[PDB]
Amino acid sequence: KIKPKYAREDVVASACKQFEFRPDLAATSIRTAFVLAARRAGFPAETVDESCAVVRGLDDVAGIMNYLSSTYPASSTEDVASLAAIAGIKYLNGPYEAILDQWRWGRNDSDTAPTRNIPKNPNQNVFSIPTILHALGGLTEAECVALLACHSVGEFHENVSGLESATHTGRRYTLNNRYYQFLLEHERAFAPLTVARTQYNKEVATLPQTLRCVYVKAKKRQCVVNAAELELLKNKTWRELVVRYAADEELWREQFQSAFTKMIESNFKRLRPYSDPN
């Protein structure tokens, strides 16, 4: 039955309206697509030292998801969640047109036991970034690198990373290739950041130790990036992709949409090609 009950653009439009009153939840909804995919792949995170696939800071997003599901019953919650992430990209002026046009449906709301992969080294606790990203549907290195431009939007939260009033790149509301340009520009100025225990970050059981920081200007904005994200700039092939995306927005948009689609389809079976229900 090539028969979704609803039009995918209606769900996207309904999520966008929510974002119009809660603009901050667009980027969190995008992060949620990664959280879900990382969890299906066996990489749920406990610490942002590994990735932002932590379960924390998603209450308000779950609020919107519940609204969308009530609004669109008969849809699976997983399908709705992927469309909300896509709506986040749209809201944040990101490239989403191919992702939406090629969107497939039928994601099973399975009741699957959470799994956590175990590193080969007994004294290793965090997985590398390539290990995690490649596993989100079998991504190429180009797709992995393309996906990280989601860090060009959103911000840090006290119950997730343990700090507030910081972003990756100094901006929050445009999802483009500025991420790559930012990393390359400030690569050598990033310094270790100590995240202190405060009365506001108690939800973060173990504060991250690998965060690094630059202050960018007539006031300074605190810009924060994982040491691991920066260390990849030392890898030849990774860096050439960062350099390339910094200069070639068109190429980046293509790879981004291809990666994002693989991610939101990863570890789902029997997804169905979309047909207009009308």
Q: Which range binds ligand HEM by CB under 6 A, 116-124, 153-161, 235-243, 265-273?
A: 153-161
Regarding 169 and contact with ligand HEM (CB under 6 A), the answer is no
Among 83, 99, 135, 160, binds ligand HEM (CB under 6 A): 160
Regarding 132 and contact with ligand HEM (CB under 6 A), the answer is yes
Question: Does 16 carry a binding-site annotation?
Answer: no
DSSP designation for 167: B
Question: Does 223 carry a binding-site annotation?
Answer: no
Regarding 241 and contact with ligand HEM (CB under 6 A), the answer is no
Question: Does 157 carry a binding-site annotation?
Answer: yes
Regarding 193 and contact with ligand HEM (CB under 6 A), the answer is no
Regarding 201 and contact with ligand HEM (CB under 6 A), the answer is no
Tokens of 191: 């310094």
Question: How far apart, in whole angstroms, are the C-alpha atoms of residue 12 and residue 178?
Answer: 25
Nearest to 136, CA basis, from 267, 272, 253, 226: 267
Q: Where are the beta strands (DSSP E) in the chain?
A: 104-105, 191-192, 211-216, 221-226, 272-273
* Total binding residues toward ligand HEM, as defined by CB under 6 A: 27
Regarding 94 and contact with ligand HEM (CB under 6 A), the answer is no
Torsion of CA 265, 55, 171, 206, to 10 degrees: -140
**Distances from the Cα of 257 to the Cα of 113, 143, 179, angstroms:** 29, 9, 16
User: Which residues would be at the binding site for ligand HEM (CB under 6 A)?
Assistant: 27-28, 30-31, 33-34, 48, 51-52, 57, 129, 132-133, 147, 150-151, 153-157, 160-161, 226, 228-229, 263
